[PDB]
Amino acid sequence: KKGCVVIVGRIVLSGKPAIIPKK
Amino acid sequence: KGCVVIVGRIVLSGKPA
Amino acid sequence: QVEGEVQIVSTATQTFLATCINGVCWTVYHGAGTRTIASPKGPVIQMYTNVDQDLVGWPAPQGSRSLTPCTCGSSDLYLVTRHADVIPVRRRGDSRGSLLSPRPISYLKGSAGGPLLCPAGHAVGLFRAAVCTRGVAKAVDFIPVENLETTMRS
Amino acid sequence: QMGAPITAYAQQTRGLLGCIITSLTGRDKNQVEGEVQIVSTATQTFLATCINGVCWTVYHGAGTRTIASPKGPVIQMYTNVDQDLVGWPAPQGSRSLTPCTCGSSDLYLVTRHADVIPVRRRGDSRGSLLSPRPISYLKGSAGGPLLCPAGHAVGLFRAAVCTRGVAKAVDFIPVENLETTMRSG
Ligand code: NA
Ligand code: NA
Ligand SMILES: [Zn+2]
Ligand SMILES: [Zn+2]
């Protein structure tokens, strides 16, 4: 044989509030 | 009178660009 | 494009915060007054104005995301400052909370309108005013989310 | 950290076609980040949670499959059909959660959309939603974590408890079952 399980995304819990950088 | 202006933003989860 | 639940806003005289909850960008009346909010298409008028609750709201602006209201009833709160600092606060009443670790007043300056979150990261209320003793903030006044919901229903 | 308060964000790293090719080759060169991985097979998508260096998910989602990695397919380290668990070594770049040791009953379920929902523990493997949600809001979330207030792993979401398309409670796999599984093997 069967195909593999594949990572198609992720969820991050360790991020903290941040000021969005102005590009 | 003057408007309230948005000068910046905060994302609670810390999600980066 | 990354979206923020919290906006850092300002008038010619002051700078503070706004928080988006339920498609509405909320802030303190003592900060915004009856002012409109800027937009690429011109001034946008307030959707709500509640002088008594010291609350005002506009439609959520572009680049914003709405925060979910708290439904867990926790008393462990977390205030987010304009500097993106997180301050643990213990809920002491409907619209009152005490800092676990008092801070100099300057640390909270310009944060009114910001959110107080529960352990799940949901909105318990909006920071209204720091409760000070000789330059030290030991507690805070806040607008419970319930008031926001009520104001809308009105 | 992971809490105080618990917040989460999601990022998509692969599209449909890329997922299929990667599934067949078993070779995944994408960089890894985060505590929870959004995973997919040919027929379904769900979550896998990293705890203590092990990437755990539900057997009903992964079956006996290997996981695609930079070095090719990786065989599961643990498998427990009865407990509905599977585990692979945590991918390089991932970050692990650690089991809860405070015994709190106030839980927070993290969905595949990175929403955090409060859950009140009612038993060893069940908890009720403080605010019920349609079952669609939870779809693809199995294998995701239920955290304590301090952001430590209490269990993994297994299945929702629904009534008329409305999720009122959730069945989860307590961390204890993970240990039992690691000893079994
Ligand atoms: Na976070
Ligand atoms: Na989130
Ligand atoms: Zn809450
Ligand atoms: Zn714990």
Specify the DSSP element, H or E, that contains D45.
Answer: strand D45-51
D148 labeled part of a ligand binding site: yes
Distance (Å, whole) CA D68 – CA D71: 8
Query: Contact at 8 Å (CB) between D37 and D47?
Result: yes
**Subunit contact B12:C7, Cβ cutoff 8 A:** no
Domain with residues C68-154, CATH architecture? Beta Barrel (2.40)
Distance (Å, whole) CA D21 – CA D26: 8
Token readout for D55 is 């990437």
What distance lies between CA D162 and its chain's CA centroid?
Answer: 20
Kindly identify which residue of chain B lies nearest to residue C29, measuring between CA atoms: B4
Tell me which chain A residues have a C-beta less than 8 angstroms from the C-beta of B7: none
Q: Quick count: other Cβ atoms within 10 Å of Cβ D63?
A: 14
Distance (Å, whole) CA D12 – CA D135: 22
Q: Is the dihedral of CA C81, C83, C84, C88 positive or negative?
A: negative
Residue with tokens 């209204």: C128
Tell me which chain B residues have a C-beta less than 8 angstroms from the C-beta of C38: 3-6
Distance (Å, whole) CA C37 – CA D13: 36
Which residue, among D70, D8, D81, D4, has the nearest Cα to D38 in the 3D structure? Answer: D8
Any residues with CB less than 8 A from the CB of D107 and at least 6 apart, and which? Answer: D118, D119, D120, D121, D127, D146, D147, D148, D154, D155
> Regarding the domain delimited by C2-67, which CATH topology (the fold level of the hierarchy) does it fall under?
Thrombin, subunit H (2.40.10)
Query: Contact at 8 Å (CB) between D71 and D100?
Result: no
Q: What is the distance in A from the centroid of ligand 1 to the CA of D7?
A: 4
> Regarding the domain delimited by D1-97, which CATH topology (the fold level of the hierarchy) does it fall under?
Thrombin, subunit H (2.40.10)
Which residue, among C16, A20, C68, C148, has the nearest Cα to D7 in the 3D structure? Answer: C68
> Regarding the domain delimited by D98-185, which CATH topology (the fold level of the hierarchy) does it fall under?
Thrombin, subunit H (2.40.10)
* C-alpha triplet C13, C16, C17: angle, nearest 5°: 150
Token readout for D155 is 């269990």
D61: left (phi over 0), alpha (psi -120 to 50) or beta: alpha
Q: Which amino acid is at D183?
A: R
Residue with tokens 């905060």: B10
**Subunit contact C84:A18, Cβ cutoff 8 A:** yes
Any residues with CB less than 8 A from the CB of C113 and at least 6 apart, and which? Answer: C9, C16, C17, C18, C19, C26, C27, C28, C31, C126, C127
For the sheet with C48-50, list strands across it.
Answer: A18-19, B5-11, C6-10, C15-21, C24-28, C55-59, C48-50
Which residue, among C108, C147, C115, has the nearest Cα to C130 in the 3D structure? Answer: C108
Distance (Å, whole) CA D126 – CA C154: 38
**Subunit contact D106:C68, Cβ cutoff 8 A:** no
Q: Is the dihedral of CA D128, D100, C99, A17 positive or negative?
A: negative
Query: Contact at 8 Å (CB) between D14 and D22?
Result: yes
Query: Contact at 8 Å (CB) between C141 and C147?
Result: no
Distance (Å, whole) CA D109 – CA D24: 32
**Subunit contact B8:C27, Cβ cutoff 8 A:** no
Distance (Å, whole) CA D89 – CA D51: 10
C3: buried, middle or exposed (CB in 10 Å: 19+, 13-18, 0-12)? middle
Quote the minimal CA–CA distance from C19 to chain A in Å.
13
User: What is chain C's length?
Assistant: 154
Subunits with 3+ Cβ pairs within 8 Å of A are B, C, D
Q: Which amino acid is at C152?
A: M
Residue with tokens 């941040």: A18
Q: Which amino acid is at D132?
A: P
**Subunit contact D9:A3, Cβ cutoff 8 A:** no
Indicate the residue of C4, C83, C86 with minimum beta-carbon distance to A20.
C4
Distance (Å, whole) CA D87 – CA D105: 25
Distance (Å, whole) CA D172 – CA D169: 10
What distance lies between CA A22 and its chain's CA centroid?
Answer: 21
* Residue A15 in contact with partner chain D when CB distance is under 8 A: yes
Which residue, among D71, D48, D86, has the nearest Cα to A8 in the 3D structure? Answer: D48
Any residues with CB less than 8 A from the CB of C23 and at least 6 apart, and which? Answer: C59, C60, C66
Experimental method reported for this structure: X-ray
List the domain boundaries for chain D.
1-97, 98-185
Specify the DSSP element, H or E, that contains A10.
Answer: strand A6-12
